[PDB]
Amino acid sequence: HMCDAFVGTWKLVSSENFDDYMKEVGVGFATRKVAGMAKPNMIISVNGDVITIKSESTFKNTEISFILGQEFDEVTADDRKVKSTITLDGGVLVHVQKWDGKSTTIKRKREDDKLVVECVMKGVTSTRVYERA
Ligand SMILES: Fc1ccc(-c2c3c(nc(N4CCCCC4)c2-c2nnn[nH]2)CCOC3)cc1
């Protein structure tokens, strides 16, 4: 029942500062502009200990499956090859990606009827709000 309140299909409804987050991460111009238009779906499911998070969009479909606390390989939407670890901390899913000596942290939180996602790279934070689809 670890992630019960996260399970579902979630659609992006708002984004703030995501272009600047992407710049800080190192995403190139064309990817930033195209990615910035999209309203992706985030589809979260759980089977035993395995959590699956799918992202479906006009740009890219991708998917991660993982066990909390257990590092895995991830290809990001902007084509970074990262080493990811996702944990639960006080009911927040905390996702750390490591690549090329860099690190970014992505938090997913249930707040009211929304899923609030905060992405941080150095001093830049972005907030993306998703609603049930
Ligand atoms: F069409 C799309 C598809 C994917 C993304 C996208 C990107 C990146 N990180 C993301 N997430 C945010 C939610 C939590 C995980 C990190 C997304 C995303 N937004 N919604 N789902 N995934 C990194 C940079 O490249 C794009 C943006 C537009």
Coordinates of C-alpha atoms and ligand atoms in Angstrom, one line a residue:
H1 CA 0.0 0.0 0.0
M2 CA 3.2 2.1 0.0
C3 CA 2.3 4.4 -2.9
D4 CA -1.5 3.9 -3.1
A5 CA -2.3 7.6 -3.3
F6 CA 0.1 8.0 -6.3
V7 CA -1.4 5.3 -8.4
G8 CA -3.3 6.5 -11.4
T9 CA -3.1 8.5 -14.6
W10 CA -2.1 12.1 -14.1
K11 CA -2.1 14.9 -16.8
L12 CA 0.0 18.0 -16.6
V13 CA -2.0 21.1 -16.0
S14 CA 0.6 23.8 -15.1
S15 CA 4.3 24.3 -15.2
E16 CA 6.5 27.0 -13.7
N17 CA 10.2 27.6 -14.4
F18 CA 10.7 24.4 -16.3
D19 CA 12.6 26.0 -19.2
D20 CA 15.2 27.4 -16.7
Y21 CA 15.4 24.0 -14.9
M22 CA 16.1 22.3 -18.3
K23 CA 18.7 25.0 -19.1
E24 CA 20.4 24.2 -15.7
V25 CA 20.3 20.5 -16.5
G26 CA 22.0 21.1 -19.9
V27 CA 19.1 20.5 -22.3
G28 CA 19.6 22.0 -25.7
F29 CA 17.5 24.7 -27.3
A30 CA 15.4 22.6 -29.7
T31 CA 14.5 20.0 -27.0
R32 CA 13.6 22.7 -24.6
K33 CA 11.3 24.4 -26.9
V34 CA 9.5 21.2 -28.1
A35 CA 9.4 19.6 -24.6
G36 CA 8.0 22.9 -23.2
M37 CA 4.8 22.6 -25.3
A38 CA 3.8 19.2 -24.1
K39 CA 1.2 18.3 -21.5
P40 CA 2.4 14.7 -20.7
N41 CA 0.6 12.0 -18.8
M42 CA 2.3 10.4 -15.9
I43 CA 0.9 6.9 -15.3
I44 CA 1.9 5.3 -12.0
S45 CA 1.2 1.7 -11.0
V46 CA 2.5 -0.7 -8.4
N47 CA 2.8 -4.5 -8.6
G48 CA 4.3 -6.0 -5.4
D49 CA 7.5 -4.1 -4.7
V50 CA 7.8 -2.8 -8.2
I51 CA 6.7 0.7 -9.0
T52 CA 6.2 1.7 -12.7
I53 CA 6.1 5.3 -13.8
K54 CA 5.2 5.8 -17.5
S55 CA 5.3 9.2 -19.3
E56 CA 3.3 9.5 -22.5
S57 CA 3.5 12.6 -24.6
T58 CA 3.6 14.0 -28.1
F59 CA 7.4 14.2 -27.7
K60 CA 8.5 10.9 -26.2
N61 CA 7.0 7.9 -24.4
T62 CA 9.2 6.5 -21.7
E63 CA 9.0 4.4 -18.6
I64 CA 10.8 3.5 -15.5
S65 CA 10.3 0.5 -13.2
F66 CA 12.0 0.3 -9.9
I67 CA 12.2 -0.9 -6.3
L68 CA 12.6 1.8 -3.6
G69 CA 16.1 2.3 -2.6
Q70 CA 17.6 0.3 -5.5
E71 CA 19.6 2.1 -8.1
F72 CA 18.8 1.6 -11.8
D73 CA 19.6 2.9 -15.2
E74 CA 17.3 5.5 -16.7
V75 CA 17.2 7.3 -20.1
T76 CA 15.6 10.6 -19.6
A77 CA 13.2 12.4 -22.1
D78 CA 16.1 14.6 -23.1
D79 CA 18.4 11.6 -23.7
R80 CA 20.6 11.7 -20.7
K81 CA 21.9 8.3 -19.5
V82 CA 21.6 8.6 -15.7
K83 CA 21.8 6.4 -12.6
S84 CA 18.6 6.9 -10.6
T85 CA 17.5 6.0 -7.1
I86 CA 14.0 6.6 -5.8
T87 CA 13.0 6.5 -2.1
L88 CA 10.0 7.4 0.0
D89 CA 10.7 10.1 2.6
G90 CA 7.8 11.2 4.7
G91 CA 5.3 10.1 2.0
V92 CA 7.2 12.0 -0.8
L93 CA 8.8 10.1 -3.7
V94 CA 12.3 11.4 -3.9
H95 CA 14.1 10.6 -7.2
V96 CA 17.8 11.4 -7.6
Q97 CA 19.5 11.2 -11.0
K98 CA 23.3 11.2 -11.3
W99 CA 25.3 11.6 -14.5
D100 CA 28.6 13.1 -15.6
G101 CA 29.4 14.3 -12.0
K102 CA 26.0 16.1 -11.8
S103 CA 22.9 15.5 -9.8
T104 CA 19.2 16.5 -9.9
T105 CA 16.4 15.8 -7.5
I106 CA 12.8 15.3 -8.5
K107 CA 10.1 15.1 -5.8
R108 CA 6.5 13.8 -6.4
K109 CA 3.9 14.7 -3.7
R110 CA 0.2 14.2 -3.3
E111 CA -1.4 17.5 -2.4
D112 CA -5.2 17.8 -2.3
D113 CA -6.4 16.1 -5.5
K114 CA -3.1 16.9 -7.4
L115 CA 0.2 15.4 -7.9
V116 CA 2.8 18.2 -7.4
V117 CA 6.3 17.6 -8.9
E118 CA 9.3 19.7 -7.9
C119 CA 12.5 19.4 -10.0
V120 CA 15.7 21.0 -8.6
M121 CA 19.0 21.5 -10.3
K122 CA 21.5 23.5 -8.3
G123 CA 19.6 26.7 -7.3
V124 CA 16.8 26.3 -9.9
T125 CA 13.5 24.9 -8.9
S126 CA 10.5 24.1 -11.1
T127 CA 7.0 23.1 -10.1
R128 CA 4.7 21.0 -12.4
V129 CA 1.2 20.2 -11.3
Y130 CA -0.7 17.2 -12.6
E131 CA -4.4 16.3 -12.2
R132 CA -6.3 13.0 -12.5
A133 CA -6.9 12.2 -16.2
Ligands
LIG1 F1 6.9 16.0 -23.8 C1 7.7 16.0 -22.7 C2 8.1 14.8 -22.1 C3 8.9 14.7 -21.0 C4 9.2 15.9 -20.4 C5 10.1 15.9 -19.2 C6 11.5 16.2 -19.3 C7 12.3 16.0 -18.2 N1 11.9 15.6 -17.0 C8 10.5 15.4 -16.9 N2 10.1 15.0 -15.6 C9 9.0 15.9 -15.0 C10 8.1 15.0 -14.2 C11 8.9 14.2 -13.2 C12 10.1 13.5 -13.9 C13 11.0 14.5 -14.7 C14 9.7 15.5 -18.0 C15 8.2 15.1 -17.8 N3 7.2 15.9 -17.7 N4 6.1 15.1 -17.5 N5 6.5 13.8 -17.6 N6 7.9 13.8 -17.7 C16 13.8 16.3 -18.4 C17 14.1 17.2 -19.6 O1 13.5 16.7 -20.7 C18 12.1 16.7 -20.7 C19 8.8 17.1 -20.9 C20 8.0 17.2 -22.1

